[PDB]
Ligand binder design. Structure first.
Ligand SMILES: NC(=O)c1ccc[n+]([C@@H]2O[C@H](COP(=O)([O-])OP(=O)(O)OC[C@H]3O[C@@H](n4cnc5c(N)ncnc54)[C@H](OP(=O)(O)O)[C@@H]3O)[C@@H](O)[C@H]2O)c1
Ligand SMILES: O=C(O)COc1cc(F)ccc1C(=S)NCc1ccc(Br)cc1F
Ligand SMILES: [Br-]
Length: 312
């Protein structure tokens, strides 16, 4: 299967990337170095993950060592919710660029549709625990994203955690200059996203699947929660193909024409997770995995559920 998918900006995006949310700052530099050494060419980043400087050390070292050329890498980051103001977007992007040791991003996403009050805190709260919104709307933030393309800071722009109506709002924007290239959403066998994926794909927007392994290290995991990696039905499909469960869970979205961004800081798993281009799930395997949908969402947040633009 081809390693890259064509975006609606004319550029090609590697269908497998390395996730970096929760990667400790003392481990992520080696994780990214190992990833690039074993073939990864796409890294998924965000300012809110608080480790872009350390990711950037790795990227810069591999560029300096001439392991890879900058043109061969596809580096993604995301505009955090407290920077959805016209006068803050460029600086937010520039801080990410500075930390990553880059002079452009391949793709910059609106991380969540909701804007929050600017300030030091990533989740500004009122005295009763509700997030404090910004009155900025997704259309004006999109215009600010378009400026970044026109200034040369980013090659593509996109969205993340946008629901169908929010994607449609962007597409219907008066005076729209650049369509979103990507919508990055949670997607795995327990949250299969058929409806949103078909909408986005019908509009030429590429979907990236986050938390493809079910984010077992998410900080709010509970003992009793469902576990993709331990699901005996998925293990059985893996065994039949002489692959690991994680490898099946990565190949699944690839065959749906999705990009997928599994996270690891374990060198052996980084390498294992990349070994997914030499086997095929059958149609029956694919439909069987789709059948496990339970609308189980790992990435959600109670404090933000009253924001006007909360997506879920
Ligand atoms: N746009 C957004 O709002 C958003 C939200 C969530 C995630 N994301 C992006 O998507 C990435 C991936 O999602 P995620 O981090 O939530 O979770 P994930 O990739 O579904 O799962 C990561 C977990 O799986 C473990 N793991 C990785 N490979 C494994 C393997 N081969 N066998 C067993 N366990 C394995 C990792 O352990 P070790 O690291 O200990 O090896 C880690 O605990 C994030 O890192 C981030 O880049 C974006
Ligand atoms: O967001 C990530 O990439 C991964 O998750 C996070 C990663 C971080 F570094 C910090 C917080 C989150 C949380 S708690 N994210 C959920 C979340 C945030 C904002 C809104 Br609007 C809704 C929502 F559900
Ligand atoms: Br949100």
């Amino acid at each position: 299967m081809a390693s890259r998918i064509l975006l609606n900006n004319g550029a090609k995006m590697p269908i497998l990337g390395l996730g970096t949310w929760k990667s400790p700052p003392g481990q992520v530099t080696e994780a990214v170095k190992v990833a690039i050494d074993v073939g990864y060419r796409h890294i998924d980043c965000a300012h809110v993950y608080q480790n872009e400087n350390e990711v950037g050390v790795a990227i810069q070292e591999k560029l300096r060592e001439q392991v890879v050329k900058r043109e061969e890498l596809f580096i993604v980051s995301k505009l955090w919710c407290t920077y959805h103001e016209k006068g803050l977007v460029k600086g937010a992007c520039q801080k990410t660029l500075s930390d990553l040791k880059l002079d452009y991003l391949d793709l910059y996403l609106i991380h969540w549709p909701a804007g929050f009050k600017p300030g030091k805190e990533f989740f500004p709260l009122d005295e009763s625990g509700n997030v404090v919104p910004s009155d900025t709307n997704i259309l004006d933030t999109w215009a600010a994203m378009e400026e970044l393309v026109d200034e040369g800071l980013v090659k593509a722009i996109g969205i993340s955690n946008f629901n169908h109506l929010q994607v449609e709002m962007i597409l219907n924007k008066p005076g729209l200059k650049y369509k979103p290239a990507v919508n990055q959403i949670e997607c795995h066998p327990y949250l299969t996203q058929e409806k949103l994926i078909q909408y986005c794909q019908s509009k030429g927007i590429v979907v990236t699947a986050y938390s493809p392994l079910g984010s077992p290290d998410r900080p709010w995991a509970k003992p009793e929660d469902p576990s993709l990696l331990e699901d005996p039905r998925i293990k059985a499909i893996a065994a039949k193909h002489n692959k690991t469960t994680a490898q099946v869970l990565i190949r699944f979205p690839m065959q749906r024409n999705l990009v997928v961004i599994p996270k690891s800081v374990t060198p052996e798993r980084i390498a294992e997770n990349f070994k997914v281009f030499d086997f095929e799930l059958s149609s029956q395997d694919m439909t069987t995995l789709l059948s496990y949908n339970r609308n189980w969402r790992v990435c959600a947040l109670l404090s933000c559920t009253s924001h006007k633009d909360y997506p879920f």
